[PDB]
Design a protein around this motif. Structure first.
Motif: not given
Lengths: 154, 148
Positions: A78-81, A91-92, B41, B75, B77, B82, B105
């Motif tokens: 779903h997400n890469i930071v 990541v998620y 979720y 972290v 980015d 992000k 996040f």
């Protein structure tokens, strides 16, 4: 594919990330563990749940058993930071499988640290769907112990 | 996308405001339509919009005394506008001692000065008890204030 709905240089670390997610999706020990250095530890978050950090010996013994009881495995990223400057990432991901214990779902907030070359992962910290893990963690443990008795006796 | 140091000053004011533990301090980096989404979720928690956040926080902060934030990991980015942080907290509450951990996040706006989207995963065993306790506390405050 997992990405459907989505200090060394950046493109080098990122390719390690991608090979880590790819190997995960491939869901075999050799494919997934290919990007893990020999000292790569895994720590389960939150710290408050006191799940002990796991060394590679225990991971290498665990994953063949775990993968063998999760069929139709599917990974979704779903997400890469990616923090290239700090040689680390987050990541998620979400997962589904069928297991001996019924249908399985999980989600993962995963934190990664790469080695100096950026071709291996050195440290993993991850926080799960703790409602899945409440039930799944002791089921896996009983299953792993059953496998060990079976192999040790032959 | 704003330059890296602009987005990072935003991250730093976020965690500093959180540490400061007042509505005005914490919320200064939130865009005016900033949403909050509780992870995983699979737990199907509805998005919390900015007006809900503005009502919640003054009540939340009032029942969390001796609040301590600890940041374990940032972290960033910048190329993707992000970020992700991992934090832990403690406090004293009217329900007993409190601890929590937060995998958060963030997404920034184009200027890099505001956060517009937040997704966060909690210590789900804290939240099992605390979330209903906090909801009933907030309903009690809303009754007290209305009758005035």
């Amino acid at each position: 594919h997992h990405s459907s709905g989505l200090p060394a240089p950046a493109h080098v670390q990122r390719a390690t990330i991608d090979a880590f997610l790819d190997g995960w999706d491939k869901w075999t020990p050799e494919a997934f563990l290919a990007t893990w250095s020999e000292d790569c530890t895994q720590k389960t978050l939150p710290y408050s749940h006191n799940v002990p950090i796991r060394d590679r010996a225990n991971t290498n013994h665990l994953f063949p058993i775990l993968m063998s009881i999760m069929d139709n495995f599917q990974l979704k990223t779903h997400n890469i930071v990616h923090d290239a400057a700090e040689n680390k990432a987050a990541v998620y991901c979400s997962t589904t499988a069928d297991t001996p214990f019924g249908p399985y779902t999980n989600e993962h907030a995963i934190f990664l640290w790469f080695n100096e070359a950026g071709d291996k992962i050195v440290k993993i910290e991850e926080m799960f769907d703790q409602f899945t893990m409440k039930d799944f963690a002791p089921q896996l443990e009983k299953y792993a112990q059953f496998i060990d008795k079976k192999n040790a006796r032959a």
